[PDB]
Amino acid sequence: RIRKYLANYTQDPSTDNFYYWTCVVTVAYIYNLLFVIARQVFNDLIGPSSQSLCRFYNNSTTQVECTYNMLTNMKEMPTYSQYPDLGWSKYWHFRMLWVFFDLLMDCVYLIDTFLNYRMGYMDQGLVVREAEKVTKAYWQSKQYRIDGISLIPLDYILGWPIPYINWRGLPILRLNRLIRYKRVRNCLERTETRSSMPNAFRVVVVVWYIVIIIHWNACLYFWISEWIGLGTDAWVYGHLNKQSLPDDITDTLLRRYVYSFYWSTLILTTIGEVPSPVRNIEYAFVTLDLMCGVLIVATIAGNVGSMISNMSAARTEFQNKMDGIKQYMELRKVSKQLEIRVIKWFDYLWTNKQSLSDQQVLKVLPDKLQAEIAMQVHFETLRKVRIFQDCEAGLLAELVLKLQLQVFSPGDFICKKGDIGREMYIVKRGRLQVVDDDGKKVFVTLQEGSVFGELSILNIAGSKNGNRRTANVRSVGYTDLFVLSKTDLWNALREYPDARKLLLAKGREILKK
Amino acid sequence: RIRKYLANYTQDPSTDNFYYWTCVVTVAYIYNLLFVIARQVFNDLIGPSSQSLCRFYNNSTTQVECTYNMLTNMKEMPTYSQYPDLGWSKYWHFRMLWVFFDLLMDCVYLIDTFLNYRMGYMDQGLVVREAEKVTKAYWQSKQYRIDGISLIPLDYILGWPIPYINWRGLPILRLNRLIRYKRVRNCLERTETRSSMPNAFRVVVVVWYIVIIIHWNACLYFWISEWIGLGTDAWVYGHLNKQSLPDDITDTLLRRYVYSFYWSTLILTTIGEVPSPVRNIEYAFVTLDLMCGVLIVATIAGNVGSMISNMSAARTEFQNKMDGIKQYMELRKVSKQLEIRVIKWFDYLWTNKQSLSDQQVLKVLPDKLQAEIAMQVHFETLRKVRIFQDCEAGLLAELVLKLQLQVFSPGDFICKKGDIGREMYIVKRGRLQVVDDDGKKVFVTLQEGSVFGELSILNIAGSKNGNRRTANVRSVGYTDLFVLSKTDLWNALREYPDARKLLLAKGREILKK
Ligand code: NA
């Protein structure tokens, strides 16, 4: 039942469900990141706690509650008068909506702290899943410190307006929820690896960081403006700042946030098309802010330039190789015809993504994976070669390890009559044909998967032109042959002497018949 | 005839005519890219559909058709009154010109859809050209979806002013022509490879992208200005924007486009010397636009910096090598004279583009091309060596594969009397001379193509100082020798035993005579 399942449960961090969970926790973290500072600085997000009072001229001048026509074209800023119950009868629905999302994100934090409690870890290359071990490792580590500091429900008692003690609230007490940044960094690291566009995603995440910095600096600008006093000079938000409040513009919560966000965007991007500071404290703030903005712009530029140089590195390497080849062919005075042939073949290899190397797989993988990949590509082709049909699979594994790719262009000759023959060819991705001594005839056409030269790899010792090629073979279009050298065959064969004698017997048989 | 040719026709994509065709299709695409959005937002491009009416003071104030003096120094914007036939009697020539270029570019799109219908593809390294196969591959792929969506003639019925139903037109319905971007990307990819300046071309294409973005954002600025209302605040185009319409400036279609393009250039380059926004919606638009402009400037900078670092990479590598050499010669206390000699030789190798390596050709080309290049450079020189004049061409092919470049500076000695001689030298790109034991005499001068030391490569077994050099040879200026080692000769020779015995015979003969 529920008790059994929850008493036994332990988590595997490498699942996909755990990744989706880390995304849920990232959503909750981003909720806190934006809205705790927004509710601290922009108090009316939970509903106004006080009444705005404007000095209105009717017969005479008296102090009344501001309308929207009183908050347009102001000659001074309004003054505030607290409600007896700090806006609770008028805005309890707004405040219960905020409380509900607070409890939702805190329940997410509690589920996360439980999954941390029953969290499986790697030990001896395996993930440990014994409830006793995982909880003991949880307590040995000090994850519980960060888990408990991040959930202290201090904002529930002291973060809301309490009218009985005239406590106005302190939403900033929910900033301990921001200690859980490791799960968010983990989610973003995992999202980059699962991404099909890892450079683009990295730039996007930096842009998201910049937008959140601009939001926090918007809240900082407005908090500094309100601490200096709104409308007291031409730099703070207010009626003397004519970019803040132009002619027919109303002073609203939306206007305060919109102007502060625009101000912060222009300052942290070093555009600076905002009013100049007036007081020494504003000069200090703006100087520091513009130096931060210089660094922020250099960071955006560095990330974009890094992405741009990473995504053009292969074309640059190809162009370097092509330039070197052309330089060589100029210095050593090669024909124009062979030069255009070289450039055609190199351009084909580019626009078809071939790379002319198996070192991609060779170097960076472990030999187990290399052997498995090679056996999946070459083994079934190699087992039908008519001299390897009666061998043990170990020999063929060693052989599929030692196969070399050779590429040919249209009309190229693989071999010609009376040539040294010391190889065996397997046709992959092409088509060959055996032409009668002039290039205007055809005997047979070799398709993919066929084999040519398989007796020239044995040594039958008196086999009627054993070493010479005895045929002409040319490529129809671009071909991809795989070659098993004679040296490689005998090197591998010396370890299997029973397969050796049998190969010799089969070769003599095929030769005689 | 025509029917036969068109029924049989099938296209090869790798031709040069097809490249010129892709350039024609790129011209048609760029036509649509600019002019569909321009005709949507800047309606008067096809001729005004309505009459501009200005409130004029003659005796009294009445509403008359605006002149150019009424559209200068305006106190308010004019109002419009549709024509009964929506400008068709006055501007049918403009509209038929636009219709003609529309039909021209749509015929280009139809030719392109036919060439896609009969389009040859690569199969087994060959381009397939059988009409049945290419059309079957066209239908198997879903190219016909994109080809048909991009040609829906909806703009011909609903994109022009129809006065009978009071339809004002919707030029934006021609935006489905912009689905064919793959042919344009293909054309630009192919233009980069054919380019002699591939870094410059890449930067130029990014600059073209930025200019088109600035054009579309100019149209966006003016559409937003017109939707808010022209002349309603100091940010939209109009008479209250005194950068839009200064003192003696007339409100024309050219002025609207010119100002919107300048505005968009200053915003997307983050210069920002334009009026500040006034309303919340303008603040939102401009904040988003300036963040896009930050990214656009970082993109331009990244592409330029990538090009700059690619075009100075070789000089940087050379300077790294030179610095390493000088560091070594300082640590190990080499003379100043040998140090200036090393630096002179390295500077020469730089300012003459030699690279001291044949690995350029060696690594990156397939062995077929390497063998052909080596045979074209070395074979005729090697066949006149007086011991290789009576050999089979296969031996000489193997030998021209195994030739090593050695470079010498002016006055350097290739060899001296009584030195171990185990090589043969072929003079390429230089001039040697045999000096009599003091360096003040001359016996013979060896020019390009000559050969020295060709008997020291054989083993005549008692050949009167067979191993010692028996002559002094020094380089006149910078020389480029190619050396055939004795080890290489015998390694290659063991495969040809008939050529071996013959070489031995010829060497004994030359030695005796
Ligand atoms: Na300025």
Curated annotation (Swiss-Prot), chains A, B:
Full protein stretch here: 104 to 619 of 733
Cellular component, GO, one term: ciliary inversin compartment
UniProt catalytic activity: Ca(2+)(in) = Ca(2+)(out); Na(+)(in) = Na(+)(out); K(+)(in) = K(+)(out)
Site keyed Central gate: positions: V297, A301
Subunit structure: Homotetramer.
Membrane-related topology note: Multi-pass membrane protein
Designated gene of the protein: tax-4
Keywords, sorted A to Z: Cell membrane, Cell projection, cGMP, cGMP-binding, Chemotaxis, Ion channel, Ion transport, Ligand-gated ion channel, Membrane, Neurogenesis, Nucleotide-binding, Transmembrane, Transmembrane helix, Transport
Primary location class: membrane
Chain positions covered by the region annotation C-linker: 313-390
Protein name: Cyclic nucleotide-gated channel
Region ranges (Cyclic nucleotide-binding domain): 387-501
Binding site for 3',5'-cyclic GMP: G453, S456, R469, T470, K513
Protein family per UniProt: Belongs to the cyclic nucleotide-gated cation channel (TC 1.A.1.5) family.
Chain segments annotated as coiled-coil in the UniProt record: none
UniProt binding sites for Na(+): E273
Residue segments, region Selectivity filter: 270-273
